[PDB]
Amino acid sequence: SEISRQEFQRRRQALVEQMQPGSAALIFAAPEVTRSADSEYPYRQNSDFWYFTGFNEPEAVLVLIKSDDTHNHSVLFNRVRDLTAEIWFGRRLGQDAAPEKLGVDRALAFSEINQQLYQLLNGLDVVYHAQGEYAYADVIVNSALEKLRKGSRQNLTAPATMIDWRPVVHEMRLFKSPEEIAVLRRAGEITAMAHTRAMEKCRPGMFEYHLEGEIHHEFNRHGARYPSYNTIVGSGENGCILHYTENECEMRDGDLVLIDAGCEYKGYAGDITRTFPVNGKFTQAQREIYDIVLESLETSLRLYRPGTSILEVTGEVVRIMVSGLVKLGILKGDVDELIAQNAHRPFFMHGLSHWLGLDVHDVGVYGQDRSRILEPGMVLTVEPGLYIAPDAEVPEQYRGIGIRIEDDIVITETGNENLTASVVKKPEEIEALMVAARKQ
Amino acid sequence: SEISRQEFQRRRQALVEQMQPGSAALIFAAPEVTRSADSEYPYRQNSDFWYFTGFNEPEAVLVLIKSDDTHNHSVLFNRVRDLTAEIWFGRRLGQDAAPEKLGVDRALAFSEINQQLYQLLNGLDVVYHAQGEYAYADVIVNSALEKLRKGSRQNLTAPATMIDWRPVVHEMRLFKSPEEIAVLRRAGEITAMAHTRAMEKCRPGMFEYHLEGEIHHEFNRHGARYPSYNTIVGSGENGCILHYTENECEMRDGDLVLIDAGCEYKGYAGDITRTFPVNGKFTQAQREIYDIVLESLETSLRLYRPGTSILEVTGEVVRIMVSGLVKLGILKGDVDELIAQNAHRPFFMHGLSHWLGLDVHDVGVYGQDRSRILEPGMVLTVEPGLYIAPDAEVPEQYRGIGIRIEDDIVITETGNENLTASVVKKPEEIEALMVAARKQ
Amino acid sequence: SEISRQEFQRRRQALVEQMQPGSAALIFAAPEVTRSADSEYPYRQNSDFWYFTGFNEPEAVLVLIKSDDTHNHSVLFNRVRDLTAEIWFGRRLGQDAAPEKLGVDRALAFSEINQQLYQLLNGLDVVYHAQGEYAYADVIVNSALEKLRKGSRQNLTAPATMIDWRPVVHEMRLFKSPEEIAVLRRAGEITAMAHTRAMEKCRPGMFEYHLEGEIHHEFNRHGARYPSYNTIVGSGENGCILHYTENECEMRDGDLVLIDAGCEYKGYAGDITRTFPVNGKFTQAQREIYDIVLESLETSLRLYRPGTSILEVTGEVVRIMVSGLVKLGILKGDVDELIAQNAHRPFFMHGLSHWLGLDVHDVGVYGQDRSRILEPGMVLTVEPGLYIAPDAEVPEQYRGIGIRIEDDIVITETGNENLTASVVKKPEEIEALMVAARKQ
Amino acid sequence: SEISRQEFQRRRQALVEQMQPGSAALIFAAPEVTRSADSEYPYRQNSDFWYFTGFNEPEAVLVLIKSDDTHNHSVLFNRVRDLTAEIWFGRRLGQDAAPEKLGVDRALAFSEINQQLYQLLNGLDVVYHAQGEYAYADVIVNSALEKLRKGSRQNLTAPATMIDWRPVVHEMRLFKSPEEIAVLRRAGEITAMAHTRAMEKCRPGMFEYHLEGEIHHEFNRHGARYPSYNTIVGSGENGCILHYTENECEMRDGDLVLIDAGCEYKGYAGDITRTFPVNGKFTQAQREIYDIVLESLETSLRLYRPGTSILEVTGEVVRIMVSGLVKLGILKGDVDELIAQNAHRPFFMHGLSHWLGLDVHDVGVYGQDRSRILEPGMVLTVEPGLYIAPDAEVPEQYRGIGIRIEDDIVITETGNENLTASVVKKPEEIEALMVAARKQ
Ligand SMILES: [Cl-]
Ligand SMILES: [Cl-]
Ligand SMILES: [Cl-]
Ligand SMILES: [Cl-]
Ligand SMILES: [Cl-]
Ligand SMILES: [Cl-]
Ligand SMILES: [Cl-]
Ligand SMILES: [Cl-]
Ligand SMILES: [Mg+2]
Ligand SMILES: [Mg+2]
Ligand SMILES: [Mg+2]
Ligand SMILES: [Mg+2]
Ligand SMILES: [Mg+2]
Ligand SMILES: [Mg+2]
Ligand SMILES: [Mg+2]
Ligand SMILES: [Mg+2]
Question: Which residues of chain A lie closer than 8 angstroms to B29, CB-CB?
Answer without folding.
Answer: none
